[PDB]
Amino acid sequence: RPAFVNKLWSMVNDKSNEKFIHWSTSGESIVVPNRERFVQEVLPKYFKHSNFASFVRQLNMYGWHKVQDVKSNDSRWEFENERHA
Amino acid sequence: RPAFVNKLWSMVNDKSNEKFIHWSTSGESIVVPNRERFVQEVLPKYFKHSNFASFVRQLNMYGWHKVQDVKSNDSRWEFENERHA
DNA sequence: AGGAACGTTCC
DNA sequence: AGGAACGTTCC
């Protein structure tokens, strides 16, 4: 499995990252309460020289898309995948 | 050792390539009698999707330079390295 | 210098 | 699907 798939899997499951990135109670989406915190505290642990933009691009390559359910907190990010039951 | 270093080493030493690329009798330079033939018959054996330009660029990365000893056959190429005894 | 890790592509 | 090869970077 691709390094990115491995990394995302480990990052969202690893208990030490729970306040920055974790599964929704249904497992349907990955929740990132605060992008800045996530970028500062988790990304550097899995990637060498990367940013949220690069992260989001990689996520797309694997079918993950940003959920747009806000009716006009830009800090909160949530991703769901194109493929589901 | 880098894949390119390995490849060049094997390509210039492998008896099957002798009419296309080989060492000078002194070992000081690599002689390529005819670039077209070399490109058509040897390069495809060691590289996936590459051309003489890309080859020459890689050669430079490792200190090999084209010998310019002609007084005004553009087909003949010869390389010597920056580092010598 | 050389072998362990980590990665991607080949088979 | 999964392991063999091949590569580069890490240690």
Short mmCIF file of N, CA, C and O (backbone and C1' of nucleotides) in Angstrom, two decimals, chain A residues 3 7, chain C residues 7-8:
data_model
loop_
_atom_site.label_atom_id
_atom_site.label_comp_id
_atom_site.label_asym_id
_atom_site.label_seq_id
_atom_site.Cartn_x
_atom_site.Cartn_y
_atom_site.Cartn_z
N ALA A 3 2.69 4.82 0.48
CA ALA A 3 3.12 5.43 1.73
C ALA A 3 2.06 6.39 2.27
O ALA A 3 1.82 6.42 3.47
N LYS A 7 0.42 6.18 5.90
CA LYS A 7 0.51 7.32 6.81
C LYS A 7 -0.85 7.83 7.31
O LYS A 7 -1.04 7.98 8.51
P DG C 7 7.91 5.20 4.01
"O5'" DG C 7 7.92 5.39 2.44
"C5'" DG C 7 8.90 4.71 1.68
"C4'" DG C 7 8.77 5.08 0.23
"C3'" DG C 7 7.43 4.68 -0.37
"O3'" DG C 7 6.97 5.65 -1.31
"C1'" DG C 7 9.18 3.28 -1.25
P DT C 8 5.57 5.43 -2.08
"O5'" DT C 8 6.04 4.92 -3.51
"C5'" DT C 8 7.12 5.55 -4.19
"C4'" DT C 8 7.48 4.76 -5.43
"C3'" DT C 8 6.29 4.32 -6.27
"O3'" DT C 8 6.56 4.57 -7.65
"C1'" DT C 8 7.61 2.44 -5.69
#
